[PDB]
């Protein structure tokens, strides 16, 4: 589960919280 514990995959998840 890299997409949740890595740095660069945070700005991506920040866009899921503003588009849900």
């Amino acid at each position, epitope marked *: 589960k890299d997409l949740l514990e*890595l*740095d660069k*995959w945070a700005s991506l998840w920040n866009w899921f919280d503003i588009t849900n």
Partner: antibody
Amino acid sequence: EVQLQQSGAELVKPGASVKLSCTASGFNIKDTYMHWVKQRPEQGLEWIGRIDPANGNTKYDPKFQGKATITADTSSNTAYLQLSSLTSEDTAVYFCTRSRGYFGNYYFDYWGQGTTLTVSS
Amino acid sequence: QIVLTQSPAVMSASPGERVTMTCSASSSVSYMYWYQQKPRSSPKPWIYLTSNLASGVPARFSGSGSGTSYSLTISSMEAEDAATYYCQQWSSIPLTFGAGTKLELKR
């Protein structure tokens, strides 16, 4: 109030096996990961690896694999760290921490008290 | 393996003056994380996500940087800050630390 109860100091023989503990209190380990860090005395920190308490997602530093074995007990809420073939370079102090990934801002929020290990004959 | 070469490793500073310490990487990373460890104690987390303080960190501390340029600065230094401030990244595996800068007081 969150705490991580580790084990006590150890003294092993050059080449024997030894296991450390880290009893996490105040939270469920299944809601996060668990990381171990080795710190050589008077030196810096060295990341060992991690384990997902719920299922198999265990990672280690490729230079640390084979020597380290991180297990976990879901019902006991305690993370364990097993070592093998203890040498003089392995003589160090070992810590215990957690990381909630993206939801916990990655940073190691709560650390254990630290466990000192020594190897000699 | 992205490693962190931290500097200035050894330094001295009295109270009141500003203190800035960097932690550059061998490859571009997106965030830097700071940890303070006092002697005979577990490292307490300081700054996360480049420039976000922890619960007990005084507001005089602050981080900044981008890419491999990453540092930690103090507005005005106080007395209970003399310790090692290890850095860490979370952008690539294996996760690496810096060797930490030892902070001393200028007597």
